[model samples]
Target: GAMALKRIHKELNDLARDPPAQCSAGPVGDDMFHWQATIMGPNDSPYQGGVFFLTIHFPTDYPFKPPKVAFTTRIYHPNINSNGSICLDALRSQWSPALTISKVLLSICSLLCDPNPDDPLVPEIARIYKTDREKYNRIAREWTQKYAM
Candidate 1:
């Protein structure tokens, strides 16, 4: 517990000093365990201009267990559900005790770039992505421009 606390404190300080360009992250308030983030839509995607909001809930056994991250912003992505649940593998199988908060954020960003159609939160969205990628991308971009930004 001591080690985890120390690491969390250090990560908070680092993030404060050097914030990521594509998003913003911080405690929801005094609660360090419930972090909030806003991620910018990746360029070239239909989600451009959309700012994706995420809520990260760290467990008591965090690092040992991956943090649960959900989107607060409305998104039309194949891997993200309307309820904000994600279909990222790292939040399940690939999480490690050595991974930092920064690493987790990067992983989420990567997920936005390349969604896993096989493990989709929205099956219809996944179908669109597979059958009509350009049209799907356009819709996602429309959502980004309208809501995410």
Candidate 2:
């Protein structure tokens, strides 16, 4: 438990001291293990001008095991469902101890820019994303404005 706390603290401190662009995260309150985060939509995407909130829960054996990550802000994408769960390799079985919250948030930004419709959580969304990218972008940008802003 202490090991995880120590690592989480170090990550938090690093985030504060050298923050990533369009990304910021910290504990929700007194719990260092649970954090609330935000990432500004990347400039090149439909999500631009929107800010999305996310939640993170570090396990007692964090760094060795991946932290739980999910979005609280509603997003329209193939990989992110209505429940706000995101499908990303770096946050799941593909996770490595070398990764940090900073890198993960950047991954999310990248996901927003280019969703993986091939391995989608929402087939309805992915169908539109694949067959009609222009329509997909329009709806995504509308969702970003309505929900994320």
Candidate 3:
């Protein structure tokens, strides 16, 4: 909790000055290091009419380490788990201190627009996205209508 507050303060300033192009963000009062985010689905996709939410939790020693990002809203995607944990490289091996909260959110939005099949959190969904693009679009649309508000 030592550096969490400071990180959140800095990030909040960054968010206020230049919010991510596709998402809205704010800290949760109960925990400054944790924030609530909502990303508008990219146009030209089945999720185009939807809004996706996520929870972001930063560790005390942040920037040096990646924040924990999870989908609070249900989404049928290849890189996100049912419980909302995302399968993104920057959160793991590709992490760098240079990455900002905006970048993370943008990356997630891009992931929804174009999923990476090489590494998938949900194999079944990845398979569908690869082999059956139409079906995958239908499922993504269905889930968006069913879960995203």
Candidate 4:
């Protein structure tokens, strides 16, 4: 609808004016509905020093619905699947109209810093995360360097 496009234009302009720290996103090619995003790994986390890429596809009724986001760069995390799908509440049932792309990216960064082992997209990773945190961090670091660098 017209309103969705209008709102998206505003958000894009605002992002251009004051980009969020540690994350950035913009339209891919000439399609405003498709975006390429990057999130710098949060400090003090195994993901640190890595640069992660993601894909964001906005729905026609965006703002009323959350955007579809998935990692393009593989990452080792309990909440993210091998296929790159994320298990984040903000992107699902807990989503609110007030949430923006920037906020979502920030939330992902926070997830990188602290994973939710209880609700995981990859159960084996979650198990490792719960029983062997050091090993989990090491593997996460290796994955980050291998795929996210």
The model with the greatest TM-score is: 2
Could you tell which candidate, 1 or 4, scores higher by lDDT? 4
| Residue 135 C-alpha lDDT in model 2 | 99
Tens digits of lDDT, candidate 1, 24-130: 78788898788988888878767766778889888877768888889988888788988999887788888888887777788778888888868978999999988
Q: Which whole-number lDDT from 0 to 100 does residue 98 have in model 2?
A: 92
Please give the lDDT score for candidate 1.
0.82
lDDT of all predictions, in order shown? 0.82, 0.91, 0.86, 0.89
List residue ranges in candidate 2 displaced over 4 A: none
Q: Per-residue alpha-carbon lDDT of model 4 for 1-149, expressed as tens digits? A: 88778878888988889988988999999999999999998888999999988999989998899999999889889899877899999999998889988889889988888898668889899999999999999999998888888
Candidate 2 least-lDDT 10 residues: 110-119
Q: Per-residue error at 2 for model 4, in Å?
A: 0.9
lDDT of 3 by residue, 17-104 (tens): 9766769887777767788999998889879888998888888888788999998888999999989999889899999988978888
lDDT tens digits, residue span 45-121, model 2:
99999999999999999999999999999998999988889999888779998999988988988888888856789
The total number of steric clashes, by the backbone 3 Å criterion, in model 2 comes to: 0
Residue 99 lDDT in candidate 4: 94
lDDT of 1 at 47: 70
Error of 3 at 63 (Å): 1.2
Top candidate (lDDT): 2
